[PDB]
């Protein structure tokens, strides 16, 4: 005998994200063996932790994988990244590229700095993270009141700075979709001037990369506003 | 691992539902 | 070990250049009675279970690749040459049997050429289109002259038209898929074959069906220098393997 | 390497035999008679000569019939010195034939795939049949089936305004209504014969040996008759297929 | 009570290759017994290993089950088969006939040669397989650098030559569908001239057959471009 | 939650022979008890074994449940039944009546003869079965070469003659649907003349009945070409 | 053996779903 069934109102409907499979039309087909392969990965999240380059704008407004410093203490900040995946200087980092395909995030962002000036050059920088509430810092002195770390030049070329995940909510939206615009700023300042000897290039370049820190996660897979490369 | 969340998820045999994974060596 | 003899009742074949006996479908007619017939079968007739040796054809330099001759069974042995076997066969509705055959043909170390000797089930033996009925002619008779191959083996229609193809098509390029042996002038003067009983039914209404066919076809043309013996025949020793007869009656007049 | 074809066969090698190499074989099943033929294929189509309310009658139209023969082999209204007799049920033909001047379409119906590729002398199986609607109008159709050798019973309507084809104890199907458009089903190997000829039957079909040579009797899976408002594409599928005694496949034209 | 069901978007759809069965309308029907039968087989693959004839073209361009050789060493090759199921000299072999119903292959091809010249005739041939990359060989000398075997005439009439399965990919397409055209060539050359005595036919014929080797397999059942026998 | 379902192409379709049941609308209804009944049967096949009358045609062409013999040896046969369910002299026997509703048969047919001439009458008959292949017999002598039995009159009134099931195929079609027309003939001949004394009716009548033998079976239920009783 | 890959593959009894195989002898 036939089984009686109640046909639900939503029939014939197709679901782009339906949690189930469909009909197989070419069964028993072996998948060409690829056991020789290396370089395989399972989690988009890992791509996120690979540090990639921040795009720093020039007066004539064109980008560099870095920023410059010299024998002076600029009254204002050297560079300033806005902790915000949507944010533009990151527009082209793997971190942001992955993040734009997800609705929310949580955890630490890691900012990586690499000193490429001459071995004979020295100096110290003050990297800081400022949470919202009192507006963005306008002076090293103010910045120094928030989360910060001093970066000393020397034998070791680089420095990993962590922008802590300090927030009201367990998660944060990944995109500038309407306007609360940000989650604070990362600002870089000179503590002491780049110092050096005669015969040395007076202007040193510091490579600036960014990446997802250890704590970090993304969720809710979505589509970004469509775009066209330049 | 993928985007599939159905319990009674068999009906069609495995080998029909999916390409068969096999290692050359 | 290339020297061999085979006996059957009061008959015996013999060869000094054999290359073994190819047994089709890897098995032989055991003489079982047909589950489709109620009457106890007539079988094991020594007088009928032997080699009937006859003439097949004259091989000449003229014949080309894939030219051939078709020999239908049991039909070719249903008449006089079939002795007691043919005589018993003619008086029964049904017959079920296998075949054991030896095809003979000798030349010399100075002759060149080769034959494809084989056996096929349900192989077309029709000679020509019967003017009027739209049917074949002499299906059950053995070819008395070499048959030319079809450049495009599409078979034979009877509707007097051409186009596409007929179900009686036989593609020679693949003839070696049938149980067979090759008779190569430089290697051997004989071939030995054997086939089981196969058919659309448990036993056969032979009177109207040639279920098996013995085919001899040329592969590489016969060749010989002037002075070399020019006359070359092809003969054959055919033997019914465990023939089993059912439905005894007044005699079918093959005649 | 070295051998002797004469004896009826030869060593079937792989690279490792003659050279410093080896067997590169991988597991694989898709080449099996059963699995391979176990897929659907069109052999012809059905066109209704009449309503769902009338008495059925053999009818041809531009090579289309209101009835068809279930066999892979070629079929059509019986041929005659004077042309195919279209007032009758299709039967097995001995060759394929163009509908007209150019090669296509074909006058005959058949499983072209199976013909171009049947590497065997005899076969058997069950047959799964599918009848799909070619049109888009709310359908009203009746389908009658019968085993090889059975009476066509192509008689008159007993009950007025109803389909004569439906008037039988034989397996018949009734399809009607919006969205209801395809008929599917499976029939048993129903032949009196033990096995079927894949291509040719080297004998006469009548005891008088005067008729239809090459065609075995009842060598089919029965037939279909249709009636109603809808034409349909008809496909067959070889179920639990078995083949015997290997033989040559249809010839392929050598490049000019 | 009735079971509630969600009706999938793909309803009423018919699948030519659907992995399932349909409704039975004439049940309990016994299948006419055929236990008497012999000659049965299950795998199309076997048909593939049965050696069948290669179609060799003549000047007036008509085919032969073989090729000819004589008391000479033709500067060029005697015959040359292109290892490629689609390939034409095989157009009519069981191997190719089966292969055209499948999308891909793997493994060895076996080329079978049978000498039908007179017993009194002798000589040697050089059969070779050349993989792609450096173009097809134009001289015995070049061919000799690839995979090869010497075939010596004598008591034993024939020779089985194996074209090895040497390839980048685990599988190879069975058909010339677009253009990489081939997987190398099989070339036959005279090593030494056919030699013999007076009174012997000077031109010997060598039967040429081809078949799938032991390693060999086919997969993915498909339909060939439809054709019409001449 | 609802169960997702794939709706097959063949929906809404009705099957005259569908192997399944349908919806019950008047349940729990007791079936009027009939335990008192006798004469019940389960297999149509049994009806087949009950011998019923063969319709023998007269010159003016009208039928009799029998045939006649006398003090002579008719050079030709007395009666001749064509072993073929479709066959007409059986048109009206239970055997044929059942058989026409089935596509194929197998096994023995039993022909029953009953002598109703006077007790004082004697004689012998030769009943025979001739298989096809050599055409139907035209003389007692020929018939005698096929399957036969001698029937001797005497105390015992009747005789059961079995037409053996001798055939190429495991089964046989039950109907003259197209044309191989038959499966041989059953012919009845006088061996010796009916002999008797003065004062006795010179022409004796032999009742002729037919039925399915023991071995016998039918299969594949179908519909006969519809008919109308005279 | 054939082109069938469905687990719940019974519903209709075997003997109904397929011709019944039987050996004459």
Nearest CA in chain C to E153: C186
Contacts of F224 (CB under 8 A, 6+ apart): D151, D153, F100, F101, F175
Tell me how the structure was determined. X-ray
Rounded distance between C-alpha atoms, residue F148 and residue F143, angstroms: 8
Are E102 and E173 spatial neighbours (Cβ–Cβ below 8 Å)?
no
State the DSSP H helix or E strand holding residue E140, giving kind and residue range, or none if neither: helix E140-143
Of G4, G13, G21, the CB nearest to E31: G21
CB-nearest to D36 from E44, E50, E112 is E44
* Helical segments of C39-169, H only: 75-78, 83-89
The pairs formed by A134-138 with CB atoms below 8 angstroms and a separation of 24 or more are A136/A80, A136/A185, A136/A187, A137/A77, A137/A185, A137/A187
CB D210 within 8 A of CB D204: yes
B in contact with C (at least 3 C-beta pairs within 8 A)? no
- Consecutive H or E run containing E49: helix E44-49
In whole angstroms, give the CA distance from residue F189 to residue D39: 58
**Residue of C215, C222, C129 whose CA lies nearest to C172:** C215
Task: Give the ranges where chain A is alpha helix by DSSP (H).
Answer: 44-49, 94-99, 140-143
- Only one residue has tokens 């450049």, namely C151
| Residues paired with residue F204 on neighbouring β-strands, in sequence order | F69
Paired with D64 in beta bridges are D61
The dihedral through the CA atoms of D159, D163, D169, D175 has a sign that is negative
- Return the bridge partners of A105, or none: A172, A218
Are E19 and B12 inside 8 Å of each other by CB? Answer: yes
**Residue D78 contacts by C-beta under 8 Å, 6 or more apart in sequence?**
D84, D85, D88, D90, D91
Nearest to D213 among C20, C135, C163 (CB): C135
Cα separation of D61 and D87, whole Å? 11
Is D188 at the interface with chain G, CB within 8 A?
yes
- CATH number of the domain within which D180 lies: 2.60.120.20
- C241 phi, psi to nearest 5 deg: -85, 110
d(CA A21, CA F57): 72
Burial class (CB within 10 angstroms; exposed 0-12, middle 13-18, buried 19+) of A227: exposed
Structural domain including D106 reads: 1-256
Task: Please report the residues numbered 24 through 43 in chain A whose beta carbons come closer than 8 angstroms to any beta carbon of chain G.
Answer: 24, 27-28
- CA–CA separation, C119 vs D8, rounded Å? 12
User: β-pairing, E52-53 with E203-212?
Assistant: antiparallel
Chain G residue with Cα closest to E221: G3
SS3 per residue for D115-164 = HHCCCEEEEEEEEEEEEEECCCCCCEEEEEEECCCCCCCCCCCCCCCCCH
Say whether D113 sits in a helix, a strand or coil: helix
Task: Name the residue among G16, G23, G24 with its Cβ closest to that of E28.
Answer: G16
Q: CB neighbours (10 Å) of residue F82? A: 18
Q: For C251, how many CA atoms within 13 A lie in the half-sphere containing its CB?
A: 9
3-state helix, strand, coil in chain F (%, to 5): 5, 35, 60
Cα–Cα dist A169/A218, whole Å: 14
The resolution in angstroms reads 2.8
Concatenate the DSSP letters of all residues of A133-195 into one string.
TS----SHHHHTTSEEEEEE-SSS-EEEEEE----SSS-EESS-S-----S-EEEEEEEEEEE
How far is Cα F221 from Cα E26, in angstroms, rounded to an integer? Answer: 9
SS3 at position C54: strand
Chains C and A touch (3+ CB pairs under 8 A): no
Enumerate domains of chain C plus CATH numbers.
Answer: 1-255 (2.60.120.20)
Among the CATH numbers 2.60.120.20, 1.10.3720.10, 1.10.10.60, 1.10.357.10, which is that of A1-230? 2.60.120.20
Pair of tokens at residue A45: 């999240």
A135: left (phi > 0), else alpha (psi -120 to 50), else beta?
A: left
């Amino acid at each position: 005998s036939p089984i009686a069934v109640t046909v639900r109102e939503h029939k014939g409907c197709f679901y782009s994200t339906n949690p189930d499979t469909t009909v197989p039309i070419y069964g028993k087909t072996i998948s060409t063996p690829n056991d020789y392969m290396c370089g395989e990965f399972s989690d988009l999240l890992e791509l996120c932790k690979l540090p990639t380059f921040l795009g720093n704008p020039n007066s004539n407004n064109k980008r560099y994988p870095y920023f410059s410093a010299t024998n002076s203490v600029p009254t204002t900040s050297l560079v300033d990244y806005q902790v915000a995946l949507s944010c533009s200087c990151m527009c082209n980092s793997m971190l942001a590229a992955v993040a734009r395909n997800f609705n929310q995030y949580r955890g630490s962002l890691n900012f990586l700095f690499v000193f490429t000036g001459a071995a004979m050059v020295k100096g110290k920088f003050l990297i800081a993270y400022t949470p919202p509430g009192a507006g963005k810092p306008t002076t090293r002195d103010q910045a120094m009141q928030a989360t910060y770390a001093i970066w000393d030049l020397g034998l070791n070329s680089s420095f990993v700075f962590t922008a802590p995940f300090i927030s009201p909510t367990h998660y944060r939206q990944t995109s500038y979709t309407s306007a609360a615009s940000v989650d604070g700023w990362v600002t870089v300042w000179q503590l002491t001037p780049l110092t050096y000897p005669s015969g040395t290039p007076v202007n040193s370049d510091i490579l600036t990369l960014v990446s997802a820190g250890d704590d970090f996660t993304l969720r809710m897979p979505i589509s970004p506003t469509k775009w066209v490369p330049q | 691992s993928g985007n599939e969340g159905v319990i009674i998820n068999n009906f069609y045999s495995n080998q029909y539902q999916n390409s068969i994974d096999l290692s050359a060596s | 070990d290339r020297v061999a003899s085979d006996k059957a009742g009061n008959s015996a074949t013999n060869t000094q250049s054999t290359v073994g006996r190819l047994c089709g479908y890897g098995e032989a007619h055991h003489g079982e009675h047909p589950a489709s017939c109620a009457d106890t079968a007539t079988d094991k007739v020594l007088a009928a279970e032997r080699y009937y040796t006859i003439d097949l054809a004259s091989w000449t330099t003229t014949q080309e690749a894939f030219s051939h001759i078709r020999i239908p069974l049991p039909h070719v042995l249903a008449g006089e040459d079939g002795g007691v076997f043919g005589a018993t066969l003619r008086r029964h509705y049904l017959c079920k049997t296998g075949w054991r055959v030896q095809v003979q043909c000798n030349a010399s170390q100075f002759h060149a050429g080769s034959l494809l000797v084989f056996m096929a089930p349900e192989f077309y033996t029709g000679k020509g289109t019967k003017t009027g009925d739209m049917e074949p002619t002499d299906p059950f008779t053995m070819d008395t002259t070499w048959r030319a191959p079809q450049g495009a083996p599409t078979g034979y229609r009877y509707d007097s038209r051409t186009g596409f193809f007929a179900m009686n098509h036989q593609n020679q390029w693949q003839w070696t898929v049938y149980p067979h042996q090759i008779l190569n002038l430089r290697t051997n003067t004989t071939v030995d074959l054997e086939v089981p009983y196969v058919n659309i039914a448990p036993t056969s209404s032979w009177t109207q069906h040639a279920n098996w066919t013995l085919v001899v076809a040329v592969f590489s043309p016969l060749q010989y220098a002037s002075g070399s013996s020019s006359d070359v025949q092809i003969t054959a020793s055919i033997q019914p393997v465990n023939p089993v007869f059912n439905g005894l009656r007044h005699e079918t007049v093959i005649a | 390497g070295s051998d002797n074809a004469e004896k009826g066969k030869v060593s079937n090698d792989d690279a490792s035999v003659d050279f410093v190499a080896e067997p590169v074989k991988l597991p694989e099943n898709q080449t099996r008679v059963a699995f391979f033929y176990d897929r659907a294929v069109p052999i012809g189509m059905l066109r209704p000569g009449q309503n769902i309310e009338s008495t059925f009658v053999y009818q041809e139209n531009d090579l289309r019939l209101n009835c068809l023969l279930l066999t892979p082999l070629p079929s059509f209204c019986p041929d005659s010195t004077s042309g195919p007799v279209k007032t009758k049920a299709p039967v097995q033909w001995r060759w394929v034939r163009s509908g007209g001047t150019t090669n296509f379409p074909l006058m005959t119906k058949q499983d072209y795939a199976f013909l171009c590729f049947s590497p065997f002398t005899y076969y058997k199986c069950d047959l799964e049949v599918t009848v799909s609607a070619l049109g888009t109008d709310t359908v009203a159709s009746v389908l009658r089936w019968a085993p090889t050798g059975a009476p066509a019973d192509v008689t008159d309507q007993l009950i007025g305004y109803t389909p004569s084809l439906g008037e039988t104890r034989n397996p018949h199907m009734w399809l009607v209504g919006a969205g209801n458009t395809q008929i599917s089903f499976v029939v048993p190997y129903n032949s009196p014969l033990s096995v079927l000829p894949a291509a040719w039957f080297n004998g006469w079909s009548d005891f008088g040996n005067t008729k239809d040579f090459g065609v075995a009797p009842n060598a089919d899976f029965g037939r279909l008759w249709i009636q109603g408002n809808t034409s349909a594409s008809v496909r067959i599928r070889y179920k639990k297929m078995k083949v015997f005694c290997p033989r040559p496949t249809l010839f392929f034209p050598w490049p000019v």
